[PDB]
Write an enzyme that holds these catalytic residues in place. Structure first.
Site: not given
Ligand SMILES: [Mg+2]
Ligand SMILES: [Zn+2]
Ligand SMILES: [Zn+2]
Ligand SMILES: [Zn+2]
Ligand SMILES: [Zn+2]
Ligand SMILES: [Zn+2]
Lengths: 118, 45, 440, 115, 256, 206, 69, 123, 266
Positions: C52-54, C236
């Site tokens: 989660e975008d860490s 994305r």
């Protein structure tokens, strides 16, 4: 102050939209003994609800933490919540639930007779 | 009493409380309080 | 920036010009004043700490100075003349003759009420010492005597921050009043929770930091400065991130800077060809090895330099907790702001989620024992809160009703009491009664 | 602010030991050894050396969290063989291999003359 | 980490023998003559100290005391060898005249090689909770066994730890070891000074009934010792009154 | 009796069992295991005068009745925390409260404004070996970074002949290939335990 | 600002190579990649540590010193 | 269990009496030494006296049963390496088996007058 | 001798390239990890600044000084300062350096690591000196001064390892390769058309026999023959990096042995 380009949404801020769009008995009376529904004709479920279980566990844990007598034998358990869970498990919680009907009448269901099926 | 340096002419000055906070050599009104004389400890990490 | 006394300033230690650069930015002077660093990025599901975008940043690279920054904060204070004898003054206050001194240290101040630059300061440390005269012979807080001619109006440091006093500037304003500006300098070292973004909309916080021996490594011993997750790529559709990593790899190998201008005739196949005569797999994949065991990872990792930006949302500027603290003047609820040691909003729809859960006692504890639990007396005749209570004398009485034996004690929020008194001011009687009158 | 001190990755604290051993009730003749202030560098080496022992039925390690420098090593051996003794033999063979490695590197580096 | 469950009182000199007989009837044990020369050391005023300690908790400076016995040959003034050492000898000790003087206590403190055993006691103010009917005080004590070196005097050792001498008192009394570990002491106190001795307990004996408990966390033991003290109080009502003394009196902190 | 110490600063972890194997020809018997801790206290007074030291060494032997000796400026103080070795006079006269506390914990709890602990060296799981008319006693010293050095403790119940034995132990340390040991047999001014603690301080101080 | 002492990724000392890099650029007429190779930066992490460094310290040094001795 | 404890007592009384007769006349018996296997129920003792060369011992090994108990006498060289005891030399050639009812102090003195010559002969 | 074998292909002052055979992958990776993180090294740890009139920040210069490599050949003869009995630092546990830089020239005065002067007592050891590698004789560019600017400071260099801070790491990058032909199939090669064409061969493919393409997979073969290139920062020689890595790993395993035996004999 602050000036950030990261759009953090202002939560609980619906009043902007509000201002944007503003234009478009027979069986029981008083508090008599008849309010107590007798045990033989209780019509509620014989099962303890999740909320009844949560409040009985919380009340019993609060009493145990405030040094109430414990009616089960302890296996080295110290936390009042699990002591209350054990008391619920072998039915040694001397409380009753007053289930209020919407008309104001209530039914008394003891924790001992209430079935903990959850 | 306390040590100050002018902003642009870099002149050293001593100021008391009653002294007006201005430079005596060039007339500038911006003075910087001097670096402390004590040793200051920094971890090299 | 060294001679600018800006209120907040963030400076990178080692700004790097991007390896993949456009023709447009050299008119924007981005290669002269860059806003990021070329971090060696692996796109890998390494430890599950980049989901989660860490992102996983290299602790060794952090130690060697990757994305280290200077933070400067300036504190401006004035001494002003309200009247003739009512004038503020910069001095080092003393507890014997000055009232309401802050609990922080005043020892770092000098005779002028200012700290010399170079001196380390921490949170709630007085950096500007100011006193104002007060009226003699009063009685406040018990600890009041005739010696207290002044009271403290000092400016301390922010309670969460620390650093080194960088610069102290003493001058005069337009009115001629003396005023000071203190720039305090600290260093923000990257840590878990700091926010970093690439130049393609790829934001994320540091999930964890691993050291170099724990990082995955290539056959040449190159470890990434950054591990980002492969799942950030496909939804994305940030293909330009991959292309810029490939171009930056080729540019770092060739010693050039890559032309990443939009509408040029520059293709991934050409960049891949140049990477192949530089001796790597043309699509940016490298065989990497697990740092824990030394074994080859079964998957080959997209590996190479990428330009990343240190964003100014650090976790230390956002972490906030309050057990108990100051209350607001009006509602006597917890105040707003982490700098004021404030509370957190338990709003309408948080309350509504608690309602849907069914936690009635937790809801009551949040709204009363965690915000404002006010005891107030009413009577049985009128439901109003106009009952005079003398608890030391055990005397309760309501004027008008003239009853002294029919007094009830209730616990309501202070906001509720304020609401009822505002209704009374607006000529509404919100009469509160402790017994029922009609059936269900 | 909340960052731990970096010497606590390798420095034992007050009142804690390098090793602690608990019996495992999941399998007979099995122990779990917590190695404090150690990491994958030791864990992989000890586990892979224990797996070379024919009388070791199970050898595994895990660092349960990267925040904390410790790992747990589960060892199960055959009946009549102590897992403590298996740990001793694995460590001793690692010591012998590293000593032979040091000797060989000394000899080959001394053979090198271009340095 | 001992706790003293303690009550205090006082008697006159005329009622001393009556109280001795009464407590003999209560306990079944004869009184036990004892002494303990207590030397008190406060932190050095020439030493700049910090209010904080090794951890981040801020503490007050405290007087720490050293107590040990004195042989009774040093308290006999060459005129009462014939009378044995019992409770009857405390009737003679009423005035300031004590054979133990400041010069000899200085000789004891300065050891003019090896030093005598001492007990190092450190006590804070009693507990502020106004729900216990007896005075509860916390005392931490060591037993200093021996010393050596060219700088072996216990006064210079106390200076090395950073504490200078402030005052000293010799207490002489009789104690009873009654039922279930209750120690009741009845003593006179003299302050030992270069200007001369002074009888602090002027014209009467001080009474201290205390129980030592190793774990003050054990609430059952605390309550049992407390109700033993109140049982003693109920047994002693009518004759003498047991009451809790002031915590400001029992505080040994250095004021500033 | 008489006591001495030898501290081998630069030695391997296995030097204990190597020295035991080298001395095995002379061992008469073996006794119970022992332990010891060595605490270092720094004085935190901001303004101290000249000719005074800020170092204080607190040595707790778990043998000799589990006793702690404080050493400072060639001054020793013997202290105990067990109830077995209290003199009965202090218990009878009410100066003691039955059970003592350790001076190390009192220093680290309520005397910490004056003395701060910095270094702790724990020698645990040691061995006691009885030679011919003599006691050697070994342990591995553990500072915060693990092993620090090897410790040998010489005890003799006569003091007339000690120098030949200590020369022999130094010789055994010579053929076990250790030449830079620090050997201490100095006294103070003077009992066995405090002289032993001073010897420990002189050995551990380089 | 000023050239980093070590490469961020691997820790190779690169702060001693900045003046020789500039000299190889301006007086030996080498292009930047050959200059890096002659300095001995073979890993592209070490190559970008010198190649992408913007040396702002002379921009800071063009200002007059605030405290002059 | 009672029978095993009783046979343990059988060997332990003989061990005690032999240790007594050896240590009374001057032998420094060793209990710091252990061997995993010394090659019914048997018990070994490694006896030494400090007037003859180092790292040599006499192995006195009793073997016991329900009826009759005897002892073997051997000479061995035991050296300890890294906390492990190893028999560097074992002499199974000149071994004799004698009885506790036949051993006496005079034979122990003859044993002293013999083992010194034997230790000199073994190198 | 029987055990892991070493064949040094290339040796230099700051690089050693070697083949490590007859050894396990866990041992090879543990040696690599110990060389990265566990070798003690001398590095500047404490900075006292008396005068800093430079354009660089105080802790900026302090971080640079910490990253300056220092000679660490006799670092075992130095003691850890937390274990030393001194109050802050002394000659037994630290090396004191001094930096004295002034802009007495009209042009920019470079402050290098050769300007660091050891002022403590080294006691005949071989530690504390900043490492000079380039031909010009200067060290690392620490700072730059305009005329009139002064940098006056004192460093305390203490021993440490690279897990505490990467400034104590002597190992730079460590090249580590096994199975260059993928005969063990520990990688599954990503490809578009042909994996052998699209993946360049490593330089270590010349030292193993290529697969015969008709022989079946060798399921019994394990990972050996590790090609390792250790690079030296300069603090210690690169052979000392390898040797002290082996010795540090050996002391870790010996400490595990001794802790196990110590709690076994209790
Ligand atoms: Mg988000
Ligand atoms: Zn000026
Ligand atoms: Zn009313
Ligand atoms: Zn009012
Ligand atoms: Zn690099
Ligand atoms: Zn030191």
């Amino acid at each position: 102050n602050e000036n950030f380009e990261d759009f953090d949404v202002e939560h609980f801020s619906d009043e902007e939209t509000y201002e944007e769009k503003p234009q478009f008995e027979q069986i029981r009376r008083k508090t008599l003994k008849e309010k107590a529904i007798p045990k033989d004709q209780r019509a509620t479920t014989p099962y303890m609800t999740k909320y009844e279980r949560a409040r009985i566990l919380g009340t019993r844990a609060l009493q145990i933490s405030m040094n109430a007598p414990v009616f089960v034998d302890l296996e080295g358990e110290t936390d009042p919540l699990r002591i209350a869970m054990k008391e619920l498990a072998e039915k040694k919680i001397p409380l009753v639930i007053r289930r209020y009907l919407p008309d104001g009448s209530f039914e008394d269901w003891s924790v001992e007779e209430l079935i903990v099926d959850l | 009493t306390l040590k100050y340096i002018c902003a642009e002419c870099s002149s050293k000055l001593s100021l008391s409380r009653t002294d007006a906070v201005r430079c005596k050599d060039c007339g500038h009104r911006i003075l910087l309080k001097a670096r402390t004389k004590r040793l200051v400890q920094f971890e090299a990490r | 920036y060294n001679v600018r006394m800006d209120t907040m300033a963030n400076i990178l230690y080692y700004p790097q010009k991007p390896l993949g650069t456009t023709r447009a930015m050299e008119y924007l002077k981005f290669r002269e004043l860059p806003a990021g660093q070329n971090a060696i990025v692996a796109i890998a599901c390494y430890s599950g700490y980049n989901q989660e975008d860490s992102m996983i940043m290299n602790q060794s690279s952090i130690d060697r100075g990757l994305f280290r920054s200077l933070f400067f904060r300036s504190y401006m204070d004035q001494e002003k003349k309200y009247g003739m004898s009512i004038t503020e003054t910069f001095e080092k206050p003393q507890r014997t003759n000055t009232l309401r001194m802050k609990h922080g240290t005043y020892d770092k101040l000098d005779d002028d009420g200012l700290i010399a630059p170079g001196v380390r300061v921490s949170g709630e440390d007085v950096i500007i010492g100011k006193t104002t005269p007060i009226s003699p012979d009063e009685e406040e807080l018990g600890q009041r005597t005739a010696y207290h001619s002044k009271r403290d109006a000092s400016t301390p440091l922010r309670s969460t921050e620390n650093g080194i006093v960088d610069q102290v500037l003493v001058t005069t304003n337009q009115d001629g009043l003396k005023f000071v500006k203190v720039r305090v300098r600290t260093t923000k070292i990257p840590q878990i929770g700091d926010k970093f973004a690439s130049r393609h909309g790829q934001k994320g916080t540091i999930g964890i930091t691993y050291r170099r021996e724990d990082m995955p490594f290539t056959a040449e011993g190159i470890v990434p400065d950054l591990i980002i997750n492969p799942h950030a790529i496909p939804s994305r559709m940030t293909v330009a991130h991959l292309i810029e990593c490939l171009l930056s790899k080729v540019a770092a190998l060739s010693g050039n800077e890559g032309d990443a201008s939009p509408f040029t005739d520059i293709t991934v196949e050409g960049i891949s060809k140049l990477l192949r005569e530089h001796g790597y797999q043309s699509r940016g994949f490298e065989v990497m090895y697990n740092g824990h065991t030394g074994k080859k990872l079964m998957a080959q990792i997209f590996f190479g330099p990428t330009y990343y930006q240190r964003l100014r949302h650090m976790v230390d500027d956002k972490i906030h907790a309050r057990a108990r603290g100051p209350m607001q003047v009006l509602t006597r609820q917890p105040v707003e702001g982490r700098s004021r040691d404030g509370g957190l909003r338990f709003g309408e729809m948080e309350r509504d989620c608690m309602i849907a859960h069914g936690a009635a006692s937790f809801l009551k504890e949040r709204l009363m024992e965690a915000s404002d639990a006010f005891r107030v007396h009413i009577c049985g005749i009128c439901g109003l809160m106009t009952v005079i209570a003398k608890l030391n004398h055990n005397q309760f009485e309501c004027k008008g009703c003239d009853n002294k034996i029919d007094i009830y004690q209730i616990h309501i929020p202070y906001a509720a009491k304020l609401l009822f008194q505002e209704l009374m001011a607006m000529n509404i009687t919100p009469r509160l009664y402790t017994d029922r009158s009609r059936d269900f | 602010m909340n960052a731990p001190d970096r010497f606590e990755l390798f420095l034992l604290g007050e009142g804690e030991s390098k090793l602690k051993i608990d019996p495992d009730t999941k399998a007979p003749n099995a122990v779990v050894i917590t190695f404090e202030k150690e990491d994958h560098t030791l864990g992989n080496l000890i586990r892979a050396e224990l797996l070379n022992d024919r009388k070791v039925l199970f050898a595994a390690y895990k660092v349960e969290h990267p925040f904390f420098a410790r790992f747990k090593l589960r060892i199960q051996t055959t009946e009549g063989y102590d897992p403590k003794d298996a740990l001793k033999n694995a460590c001793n063979s690692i010591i012998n291999k590293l000593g032979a490695l040091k000797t060989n590197f000394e000899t080959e580096w001394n053979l090198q003359t271009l340095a | 980490m001992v706790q003293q469950l303690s009550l205090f009182g006082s008697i006159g000199d005329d009622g001393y023998d009556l109280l001795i007989s009464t407590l003999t009837t209560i306990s079944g044990n004869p009184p036990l003559l004892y002494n303990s020369l207590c030397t008190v050391w406060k932190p050095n005023p020439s030493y700049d100290v910090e209010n904080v300690n090794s951890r981040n908790q801020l503490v007050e400076p405290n007087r720490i005391k050293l107590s040990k016995e004195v042989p009774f040959s040093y308290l006999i003034d060459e005129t009462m060898m014939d009378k044995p050492l019992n409770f009857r000898i405390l009737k003679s000790f009423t005035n300031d005249k004590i054979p133990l003087n400041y010069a000899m206590t200085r000789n004891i403190l300065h050891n003019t090689e090896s030093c005598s055993p001492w007990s190092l006691q450190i006590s804070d103010i009693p507990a502020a909770g106004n729900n216990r009917s007896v005075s509860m005080q916390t005392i931490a004590e060591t037993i200093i066994l021996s010393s050596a070196g060219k700088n072996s005097s216990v006064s210079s050792l106390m200076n090395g730890l950073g504490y200078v001498f402030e005052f000293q008192y010799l207490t002489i009394g009789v104690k009873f070891f009654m039922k279930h570990g209750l120690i009741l002491e009845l003593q006179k106190i003299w302050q030992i000074e270069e200007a001369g001795n002074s009888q602090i307990t002027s014209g009467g004996f001080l009474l201290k009934a205390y129980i030592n408990v190793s774990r003050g966390t054990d609430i059952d033991r605390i309550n049992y010792t407390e109700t033993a003290l109140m049982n003693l109080k109920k047994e002693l009502q009518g004759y003498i009154e047991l009451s809790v003394p002031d915590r400001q009196s029992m505080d040994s902190r250095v004021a500033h | 009796g008489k006591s001495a110490v030898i501290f081998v600063e630069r030695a391997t972890p296995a030097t204990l069992t190597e020295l035991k194997d080298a001395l095995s020809n002379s061992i008469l018997s073996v006794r119970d295991p022992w332990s010891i801790d060595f605490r270092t206290y720094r004085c935190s007074i901001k303004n101290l005068p000249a000719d005074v030291s800020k170092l204080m060494y607190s040595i707790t032997f778990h043998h000799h009745g589990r006793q702690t000796v404080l050493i400072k400026d060639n001054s020793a103080m013997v202290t105990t925390a067990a109830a077995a070795d209290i003199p009965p006079a202090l218990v009878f006269n009410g100066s003691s409260t039955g059970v003592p506390e350790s001076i190390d914990t009192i220093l680290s709890s309520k005397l910490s404004n004056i003395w701060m602990q910095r270094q702790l060296i724990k020698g645990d799981a040691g061995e006691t070996l009885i030679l011919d008319g003599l006691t050697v006693r070994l342990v591995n010293l553990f500072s915060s970074t693990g092993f620090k050095g090897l410790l040998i403790e010489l005890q003799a119940d006569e003091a007339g002949e000690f120098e030949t034995k200590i020369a022999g132990i130094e010789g055994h340390l010579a053929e076990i290939r250790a030449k830079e040991y620090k050997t201490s047999s100095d006294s103070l001014g003077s009992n066995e335990i405090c002289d032993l603690a001073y010897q420990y301080v002189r050995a551990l101080e380089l | 600002m000023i050239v980093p002492v070590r490469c961020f990724s691997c820790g190779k000392v690169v702060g001693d190579k900045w003046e020789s890099y500039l000299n190889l650029l301006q007086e030996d007429e080498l292009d930047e990649g050959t200059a890096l190779s002659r300095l001995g930066l073979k890993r592209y992490c070490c190559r970008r540590m010198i190649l992408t460094h913007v040396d702002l310290i002379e921009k800071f040094l063009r200002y007059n010193p605030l405290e002059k001795r | 269990e009672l029978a095993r404890i009783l046979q343990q007592l059988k060997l332990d009384k003989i061990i005690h009496v032999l240790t007594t007769m050896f240590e009374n006349t001057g032998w420094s018996c060793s209990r710091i030494i252990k061997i995993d296997k010394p090659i019914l129920l048997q018990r070994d003792l490694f006896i030494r006296l400090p007037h003859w060369p180092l790292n040599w011992y006499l192995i006195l090994s009793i073997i016991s049963s329900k009826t009759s108990c005897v002892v073997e006498k051997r000479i061995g060289k035991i050296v300890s390496q890294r906390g492990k005891w190893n028999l560097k030399y074992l002499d199974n050639s000149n071994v004799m088996t004698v009885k506790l009812e036949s051993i006496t102090y005079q034979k122990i003195m003859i044993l002293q007058r013999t083992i010194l010559n034997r230790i000199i002969n073994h190198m | 001798s029987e055990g892991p074998q070493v064949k040094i292909r290339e040796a230099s002052k700051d690089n050693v390239d070697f083949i490590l055979s007859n050894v396990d992958l866990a041992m090879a990776n543990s040696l690599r990890r110990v060389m990265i993180a566990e070798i003690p090294t001398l590095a500047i740890d404490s900075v006292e600044v008396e005068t800093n009139t430079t354009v660089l920040a105080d802790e900026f210069i302090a971080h640079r000084l910490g990253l300056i490599p220092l000679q660490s050949m006799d670092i075992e003869q130095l003691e850890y300062s937390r274990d030393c009995f001194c109050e802050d630092h002394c000659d037994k546990c630290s090396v004191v350096l001094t930096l004295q830089a002034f802009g007495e020239s009209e042009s920019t005065t470079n402050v290098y690591s050769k300007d660091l002067v050891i002022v403590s007592n080294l006691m005949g050891r071989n530690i504390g000196h900043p490492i000079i590698q380039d031909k010009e004789g200067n060290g690392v560019l620490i700072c730059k001064l305009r005329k009139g600017q002064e940098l006056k400071l004192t460093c305390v260099a203490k021993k440490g390892i690279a897990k505490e801070h990467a400034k104590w790491g002597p190992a730079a990058a460590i090249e580590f390769e096994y199975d260059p032909w993928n005969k063990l199939k520990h990688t599954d090669y990503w490809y578009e058309q042909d994996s052998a064409k699209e993946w360049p061969q490593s330089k270590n493919c010349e030292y193993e026999d290529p697969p015969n393409e008709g022989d079946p997979f060798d399921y019994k073969a394990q990972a050996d023959t590790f090609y390792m290139n250790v690079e030296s920062v300069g603090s210690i020689p690169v052979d000392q990096v390898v040797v002290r890595g082996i010795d540090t790993l050996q002391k870790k395993v010996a400490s595990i042995l001794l802790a196990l035996t110590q709690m076994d004999q209790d």
